[PDB]
Design an enzyme around this catalytic site. Structure first.
Site, PDB file in Angstrom:
ATOM      1  N   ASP A  55       0.826  -1.200   0.000  1.00 25.29           N
ATOM      2  CA  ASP A  55       0.000   0.000   0.000  1.00 25.29           C
ATOM      3  C   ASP A  55       0.862   1.252   0.000  1.00 25.29           C
ATOM      4  O   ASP A  55       1.660   1.475   0.914  1.00 25.29           O
ATOM      5  CB  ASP A  55      -0.928  -0.004   1.213  1.00 25.29           C
ATOM      6  N   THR A  88      -4.291   5.027  -3.952  1.00 29.55           N
ATOM      7  CA  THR A  88      -2.951   5.463  -3.605  1.00 29.55           C
ATOM      8  C   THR A  88      -1.907   4.559  -4.221  1.00 29.55           C
ATOM      9  O   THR A  88      -0.763   4.985  -4.407  1.00 29.55           O
ATOM     10  CB  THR A  88      -2.778   5.483  -2.098  1.00 29.55           C
ATOM     11  N   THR A  89      -2.276   3.324  -4.551  1.00 24.76           N
ATOM     12  CA  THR A  89      -1.427   2.543  -5.433  1.00 24.76           C
ATOM     13  C   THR A  89      -1.204   3.246  -6.769  1.00 24.76           C
ATOM     14  O   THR A  89      -0.323   2.834  -7.528  1.00 24.76           O
ATOM     15  CB  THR A  89      -2.021   1.141  -5.643  1.00 24.76           C
ATOM     16  N   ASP A 386      -8.243  -1.747   3.219  1.00 23.36           N
ATOM     17  CA  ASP A 386      -8.525  -1.232   1.883  1.00 23.36           C
ATOM     18  C   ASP A 386      -9.756  -1.905   1.287  1.00 23.36           C
ATOM     19  O   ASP A 386     -10.633  -1.241   0.715  1.00 23.36           O
ATOM     20  CB  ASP A 386      -7.306  -1.418   0.981  1.00 23.36           C
TER      21      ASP A 386
END
Lengths: 521, 525, 525
Positions: A55, A88-89, A386
């Protein structure tokens, strides 16, 4: 000396180039981490531990910086993570490449503000286009939800445990809905506690229809196993307490001392029969418990647990539906712990735990994670965070988007059409944004390890065809794949916030033109 | 790359940090491989404080040999989890990790991207787990079976003679523990050590032992027949929580208030005395009292005048243990007190050693809690044999829990080798490479056994690599002649739980480690 | 252990230092493996002085990338010897060493004492050498054969186009060198560079070039037909070795002694002038003089007045080169001087570049010495292409020396693999392990070729690992499609000397390195 005496300053194109360089570096240090083919990153924390996670948010959060714009990007990543979980990846990568193409117009002497206006128009059109290319989907249908979760998680370590992960997330999220808002009930992700216990295997981890308490029975006698317990939540301490008003006593007659000693005993008793009048079975408190009250409760065959964290108390209450109480004399049968299918205290190995399962309609729940070791468990729980986050986003919006870069290419040619219909100086920035978008599928390709240029060209040319917008990039084959049969789908709000924060990053950085140090305040 | 972001930060890169991890794991396994195997040699560690260890259980080594390489700490954590589950194989776990990573490097260095070997490991773990489940030998709770299991676990740690002595104690304990459904290994197992007279003479005591002695001379040293009073309510003085300093006017009232202040504790002790005298109307029977809190010296005098043994400040699980030993009713309020709440022991006396004092509880009618009284000539040996005891206990607990048991001496490992190698590339082909590597790494246990025992590796491995016939047996490696051995016949076993857990943990750890590329260090100053 | 003897000394031990050596070799081979193969990428080195290299020849890298690990320096020395023999394969040598040691560690880590693998290496080297001798392709000195050899050597170093241009020059040189029995590569090969106009335009000049120019204006720049006078005796002033400061009394005698002092050099120059005028009675012919020592300015005036070109202070091999170019008689005593001692050139002129001056000798009737005039746009490229030139020259020299030639692209290596693996343990058995490892390590050359060229290693190696039929050919690896290739047909070769020497050197180095146990450091402060 004039200004501040050891405060530096820097100006103009130098500053712009430096910030762009910083942003590009920030993007670069993560470009390998995206995609189902993703890498696995681990961290050296300042204070000794080991942290390993795909992450991006955690990766960046364990980064300190000196250049400021890097810090700005760090905060951007943390915000996007907080709001949506993943993306956010990809978010910072997109922002960095956005900026990188953006700088190319600086040496055009193109002043930033007009480019900014172009970006704003670009964001508007991108939002519109994505909304046009969504798919509404049912929320009740379980297996489509599971498919969505699998799609959103098949990028991190839990991929091989996809079935368990999806079942866990669906179960947890589905059963957390505070219907007291009429038809506008809201789920919350601070009652979905995550507990990491070493040993066992991933396969052993499961959703427990209740709560986990890392405490033990205070006295041997209380039964460690009960079918239909009754639970009372005592927020107040159960023992004799300081007279808050600095009271004092001046005894004169002999019996008086022993009498006052008996009085606190009597008060303890009073509390005890006040509790037992309600025929409970379970006593829980965040505070301590007098061993004398412990005696009385034992005499009533009542299980008691002491000194549990307040959040844990709240979760237990939400589990067995009862409400916390701070006054035993004001105890009400309405707060009797009805709705506990089973009370139990097991041994995980060298440690007791508390199991409260099989609630009638539990609204709170904690997940029991049982794996190999605390760091892998932490990675697992981050991935679970997530997954359950995107699941809740779906339960807020039933609209879905085809990922795998497909939406990106749709946006690309849409903006291309708008640009070629949108003559002006701002045209070039607009199509520049369009081209900058193309890099998410690109990064997918390199992380796969295929011919990036030819694959990307085939993709874009494929997507000039109006008949299909579902053509995306497979993670492993490295081949053009229509997304429908592949099934990598994502919640709309995810990608929305993604682009939205991205262009915000762009504007905020491009307006910057100077640096000042040493505030000393 | 991140250097431009931060100068004082540090990174490696993909090849570099991968090499870092494999090298660190290889070094760690080299350090540890001397341990496993009864012929193995245990290690002495010396702390900077001047203390001393003489263990072989690797978990102690990793936790107590300070290392800085990150993956080393990671492996130490996973081994600690393992030890908190089963007790040995921490050595086996770290060896598996290191050598599996070794084979992984052998293959990736040939350009194979690691993820392929990851998938191969996944499939191989699945097949190996299936085989492990099918091969486990279901055996009932025969006493000799448990004896053999304990011996196999223990001979890893100490003298053969010491393990032989201790095995009877541990098996008798475990047999005397179960309520046929759930042992907890905590209350009924009391682990105490006295610096006394032997390491061999350590033996199970059928009752409970306490780590303190009487606080008065008139306290009788020995009691023929004992009645136990288990309590924790203070028989020491205490003053109420609310400020209660008082005043007086005549010096006689000073004495009167002193008497009054004592009177409450006087009542407390008098209730106990009356209980005794009601019950112990006979002269012979003895009354003993255990308090989790303290006892006042005046209270000591009171109890002594009735010849009542009382002990103060025992650890909070000791009353649990007394409950499970003499069946006494642990109470708090002496106000609600009955003879029925008492506990009975066949014998209780005091043993004085050195300066400390010890207390014995003996001859419980149906004891459910016992004590492995550790006799030790030397302080370090106490700790070492204590770790060994805990290992054996946990092993036996797993053995009773799982109605099956795995033959020891790595016959399971050669079985995994022959089974996994007997997988055609039913996998997607490239993963067959990783499967091959995993099966190769599995063979370490026999390898390290032979190496520690002195025999030549390759030839022994080949020799044992002879599944005989349709009855291709599970063949263990002889630990003194280096020859094929039927583990089941010689009765060398181990818990299924151990093997399953180690396989799963090692698979996860390895697949995670092989998926790191750079090791960065950017933290606050 | 030696610590007790000396505190500041340092040692490792057997396992430790063996691991040190293997790790260092592995790191070195990792650094170097990017080089070999025409698709390889050459390296730029920057000295602390700010200089620059852009080479690929590994010997430059090892000698110029400062390393501290001892075995690294050892390997650098052996590579330097190699380069002093043949020119390339230094890369190949170090790769062979590293990967052979890698396999050796793979086996010894399985407990095999290294000496066994040593013996296996010995036997394997013997069989491989026999096969290498039998397989070498005897080919005559066909021009195209040498052309192909040079191209194969050169494409390792530079642009394909640059190598193509340079190949014709080098082959024409070598062809124009041999006196059918012995080339020496020194005199006839003049290597000069001018910072001029291209890297491509570097070309052979049929004559000799000199690195200095005339020292007077009246010196004619160009000479149609030239007669060469090769000499080294001083035409500068000099004073006898014995102290000879002299005195005089009249100022006229001062002038007289000045004339006398000059008179000896006057005689020297006058002899040369008379020789010229005797021979060059014709107006057209030109007289040029080369002196290894200096020329006096007055002597310059004298020679200029006769229009005679003279050059001073050429390197001591330049007269050798002039002898082999224009057949002039290099002499010392001008007293014994004849027209027969002259040298003749078809053309001689001066070329001015920058500030330096250059001299050309052209159109020798039967030149036996030539010059590879290096034109370079950039100083570093001069050095790089010069190293490339020397490599190609030495390769061609070995090619002409040995009436055989080995097909390139590692077909020899797959042949060694198939032959060595086709040895039943006719060895004493345990050595078959080392033989297997050696054969495995031999396959590196195709492996690194494919890896540098981008193709997947294992599948390419398997594919080429197809000896076809009774005509199982020597198959090379395609450098652009990753497909089996007949090296002989495509004409990719290499010197037998190279392969034989590298095999022997690597075998010796490896067998020595695998036999070290500790690396001690005890020297004076």
């Amino acid at each position: 000396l004039v200004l501040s005496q050891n405060t530096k300053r820097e100006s103009g194109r130098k500053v712009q180039s430096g910030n762009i360089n910083a942003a590009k570096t920030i993007a670069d240090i993560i470009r390998t981490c995206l995609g189902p083919k993703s890498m696995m990153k681990m961290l050296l924390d300042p204070m000794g531990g080991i942290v390993m996670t795909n992450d991006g948010n955690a990766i960046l959060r364990e980064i300190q910086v000196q250049h400021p714009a890097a810090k700005s990007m760090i905060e951007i990543s943390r915000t996007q993570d907080e709001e949506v979980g993943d993306g956010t990846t990809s978010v910072i990568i997109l922002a960095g490449e956005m900026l990188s193409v953006a700088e190319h117009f600086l040496e055009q002497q193109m002043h930033p503000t007009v480019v900014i206006s172009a970006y704003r128009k670009a964001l508007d059109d991108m939002i519109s286009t994505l909304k046009k290319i969504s798919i509404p989907v049912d929320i009740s249908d379980s297996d489509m939800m599971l498919n969505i979760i699998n799609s959103s998680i098949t990028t991190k370590a839990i991929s091989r445990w996809s079935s368990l992960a999806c079942n866990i997330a669906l179960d947890a999220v589905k059963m957390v809905q505070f219907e007291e808002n009429g038809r506008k009930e809201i789920d919350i992700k601070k009652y979905a506690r995550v507990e990491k216990i070493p040993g066992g295997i991933i396969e052993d981890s499961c959703v427990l229809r209740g709560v986990m308490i890392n405490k033990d029975v205070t006295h041997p006698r209380m039964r460690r196993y009960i079918k239909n317990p009754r639970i009372v939540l005592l927020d107040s301490s159960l023992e004799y307490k300081k007279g808050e008003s600095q009271t004092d006593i001046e005894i004169t007659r002999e019996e008086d001392f022993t009498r006052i000693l008996q009085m606190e005993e009597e008060y303890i008793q009073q509390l005890c029969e006040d509790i037992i009048q309600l025929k409970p079975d379970v006593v829980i408190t965040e505070k301590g418990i007098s061993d004398l009250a412990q005696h009385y409760l034992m005499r009533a065959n009542i299980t008691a647990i002491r000194r549990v964290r307040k959040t844990d108390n709240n979760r237990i209450a939400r589990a067995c539906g009862a409400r916390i109480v701070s006054r035993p004399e004001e105890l009400r049968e309405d707060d009797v712990g009805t709705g506990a299918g089973l009370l139990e205290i097991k041994k995980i190995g060298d440690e007791y735990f508390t199991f409260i399962t099989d609630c009638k309609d539990p609204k709170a729940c904690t997940i029991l994670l049982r794996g190999a070791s605390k760091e892998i468990l932490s990675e697992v729980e981050r991935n679970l965070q997530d997954a359950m986050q995107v699941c809740r986003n779906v339960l807020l919006d039933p609209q879905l988007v085809p990922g795998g870069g497909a939406s990106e290419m749709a946006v690309a040619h849409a903006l291309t059409e708008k640009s070629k219909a949108m003559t002006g100086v701002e045209q070039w920035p607009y199509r520049a944004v369009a081209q900058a978008l193309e890099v998410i599928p690109r990064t997918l390709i390199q992380n796969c390890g295929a011919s990036t240029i030819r694959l990307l060209t085939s993709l874009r040319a494929k997507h000039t065809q109006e008949n299909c917008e579902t053509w995306g990039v497979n993670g492993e084959t490295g081949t053009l794949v229509d997304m429908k049969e592949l099934g990598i789908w994502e919640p709309l709000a995810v990608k929305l916030q993604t682009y939205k924060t991205a262009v915000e990053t762009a504007v905020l950085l491009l307006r910057i033109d100077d640096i000042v140090s040493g505030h000393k305040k | 790359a991140v250097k431009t972001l931060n100068p004082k930060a540090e990174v490696a890169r993909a090849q570099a940090a991968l090499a870092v991890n494999i090298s660190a794991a290889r070094g760690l396994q080299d350090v540890l491989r001397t341990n496993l195997g009864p012929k193995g040699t245990m290690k002495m560690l010396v702390s900077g404080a001047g203390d001393i260890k003489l263990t072989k259980d690797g978990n102690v080594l990793l936790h107590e040999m300070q290392i800085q390489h990150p993956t080393a700490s990671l492996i130490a954590k996973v081994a600690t989890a393992q030890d908190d589950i089963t007790g040995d194989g921490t050595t086996s776990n770290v060896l598996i990790i290191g050598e599996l990573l070794k084979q992984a490097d052998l293959y990736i260095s040939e350009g194979l991207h690691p993820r392929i070997i990851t998938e191969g490991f996944e499939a191989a773990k699945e097949k190996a787990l299936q085989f492990l489940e099918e091969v486990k030998v279901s055996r009932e709770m025969d006493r000799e079976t448990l004896i053999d299991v304990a011996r196999t676990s223990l001979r890893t740690k100490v003298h053969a003679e010491l393990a032989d002595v201790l095995t009877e104690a541990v098996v008798d304990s475990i047999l005397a523990i179960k309520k046929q459904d759930e042992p907890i290994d905590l209350f009924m197992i009391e682990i105490m050590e006295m610096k006394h007279k032997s390491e061999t003479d350590t033996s199970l005591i059928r009752g409970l032992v306490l780590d303190h002695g009487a606080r008065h001379p008139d306290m009788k040293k020995r009691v023929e027949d004992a009645y136990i009073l288990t309590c924790n309510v203070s028989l020491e003085y205490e003053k109420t929580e609310v400020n209660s300093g008082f005043f007086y006017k005549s010096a006689e009232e000073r004495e009167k208030l002193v008497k009054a202040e004592r009177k409450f504790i006087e009542d407390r002790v008098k209730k106990i005395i009356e209980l005794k005298r009601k019950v112990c109307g006979d002269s012979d029977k003895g009354f003993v009292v255990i308090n989790q809190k303290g006892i006042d010296p005046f209270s000591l005098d009171a109890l002594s005048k009735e010849g009542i043994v009382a002990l103060r400040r025992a650890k909070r699980r000791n009353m649990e243990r007394l409950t499970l030993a003499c069946g006494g009713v642990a109470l708090n309020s002496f106000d609600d007190l009955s003879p029925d709440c008492l506990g009975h022991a066949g014998l209780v006396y005091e043993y004085t050693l050195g300066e400390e004092k010890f207390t014995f509880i003996e001859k419980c009618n149906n004891p459910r809690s016992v004590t492995l009284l550790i006799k030790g000539p030397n302080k370090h040996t106490l700790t070492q044999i204590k770790d060994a005891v805990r290992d054996g206990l946990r092993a036996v607990k797993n053995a009773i829990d799982d109605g099956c048991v795995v033959p020891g001496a790595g016959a399971v490992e050669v079985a995994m080798a022959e089974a996994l190698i007997k997988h055609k590339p039913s996998v997607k082909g490239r993963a067959q490479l990783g499967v091959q590597a995993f099966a190769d790494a599995l063979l370490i246990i026999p390898k390290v056994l032979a190496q520690n025992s002195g025999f030549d590796l390759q030839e022994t491995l080949v020799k044992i690599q002879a599944e005989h016939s349709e009855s291709g047996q599970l063949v263990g490696v002889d630990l003194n002649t280096g020859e094929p051995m039927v583990a089941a016949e010689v009765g060398v076993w181990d818990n299924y739980c151990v093997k399953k857990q180690l396989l799963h943990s090692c698979t996860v750890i390895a697949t995670n480690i092989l998926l790191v590329d750079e090791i960065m260090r950017a933290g606050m100053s």
